[PDB]
UniProtKB/Swiss-Prot annotation:
Originating organism: Saccharomyces cerevisiae (strain ATCC 204508 / S288c) (Baker's yeast)
Listed Basic and acidic residues bias regions: 303-319
Protein name: Vacuolar protein sorting-associated protein 4
Family listed: Belongs to the AAA ATPase family.
Misc remark: Present with 5350 molecules/cell in log phase SD medium.
GO biological process: autophagosome maturation; autophagy; endosomal transport; intralumenal vesicle formation; late endosome to lysosome transport via multivesicular body sorting pathway; late endosome to vacuole transport; late endosome to vacuole transport via multivesicular body sorting pathway; macroautophagy
Length: 319
């Protein structure tokens, strides 16, 4: 029981997820509240079996689910609809069945169907017979998740709530919107992503970098920082000259790269430096700007519109 389906006791706390305060809240009421106080839900008030998370690409939907499942001391079982409907097309019902199977045997637990939209785009046989089986098998499995037992909740995710099979949509009672990151979020994300790395920037800087990347998403900023992080490696990769900037207090001499005429520079390469005596240059403001300036926000307003529309026409109620 593996491969196409991922398992784990995930370890992501609400604090690990940047901003999304409103969504985080939503989920506590929808998920943690029933879990922790369970027979608050006697009678006609029953808990939610289906929760969809929609938003534009990169806004934390996957991460937040893990966070949910961790904040609900749960086990996380997750499938990638794309793959499921295109790369595992052979054993899709087998896999869907196995997903729900494994969930129930590991109660309490959460199922994460990513890219729920990838179960539609309908034609005649390829994506409308060879596929519709999967749509059904999932639908059937979920008749069993409002019935059978509830210690198993389905979370679904899309970046395209407007391609979500009508039938499938309705099966997710509660729907929640995961927007692009606010300045606040965007700043903590820059910090989170950089964490330990030796780095010049003060908080105000990050504040500014945040300010400078409005429109960017979670993945976007992640790309940026990843990119930014190779500056030091690249620099270390390509002097020429190194310096011994260790102070009277380092155990060992710390040889950082430097301009070639420059006080104390002696010409070498990284291949000359010993294990203990290398000193990666700190990230610089310029490092980050360079990175940002060669990234473009992945999400454009066209997307956002369709996103807001769905919020309006299906956001809440039914539907
Ligand atoms: N709110 C957040 N807090 C911390 N990291 C985030 C956040 N949002 C996005 N990220 C980062 O961006 C990565 C990709 O985002 P996901 O968590 O996959 O959410 P998503 O909305 O499903 O984005 P995808 O997968 O591109 S559609 C994450 O694994 C994190 O590295
Ligand atoms: Mg995702």
């Amino acid at each position: 029981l593996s491969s196409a389906i991922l398992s784990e006791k995930p370890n992501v706390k609400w604090e690990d997820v940047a901003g999304l305060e409103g969504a985080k809240e939503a989920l506590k009421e929808a998920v943690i509240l029933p879990v922790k106080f369970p027979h608050l839900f006697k009678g006609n008030r029953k808990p939610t079996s289906g929760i969809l998370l929609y938003g534009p690409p990169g806004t934390g939907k996957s991460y937040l689910a893990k966070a949910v499942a961790t904040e609900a001391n749960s086990t996380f079982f997750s499938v990638s609809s794309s793959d499921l409907v295109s790369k595992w097309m052979g054993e899709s019902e087998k896999l869907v069945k196995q997903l729900f199977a494994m969930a129930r045997e590991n109660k309490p637990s959460i199922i994460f169907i990513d890219q729920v939209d990838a179960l539609t785009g309908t034609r005649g046989e390829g994506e409308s017979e060879a596929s519709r089986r999967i749509k059904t098998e999932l639908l059937v499995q979920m008749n069993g998740v409002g019935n059978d037992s509830q210690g198993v909740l389905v979370l679904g995710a899309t970046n395209i709530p407007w391609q979500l099979d009508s039938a499938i949509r309705r099966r997710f009672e509660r729907r929640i919107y995961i927007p692009l990151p606010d300045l606040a979020a965007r700043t903590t994300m820059f910090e989170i992503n950089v964490g330990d790395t030796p780095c010049v920037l003060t908080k105000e800087d990050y504040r500014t970098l945040g300010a400078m990347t409005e429109g960017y998403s979670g993945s976007d900023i992640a790309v940026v920082v990843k990119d930014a992080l190779m500056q030091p490696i690249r620099k270390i990769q390509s002097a020429t000259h190194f310096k011994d900037v260790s102070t009277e207090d380092d155990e060992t001499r710390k040889l950082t790269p430097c301009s070639p005429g420059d006080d104390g520079a002696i010409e070498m390469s990284w291949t000359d430096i010993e294990a203990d005596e290398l000193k990666e240059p700190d990230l610089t403001i310029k490092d980050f700007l360079k990175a940002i300036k060669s990234t473009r926000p992945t999400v454009n307003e066209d997307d956002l519109l369709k996103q807001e529309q769905f919020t309006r026409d299906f956001g809440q109620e039914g539907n």
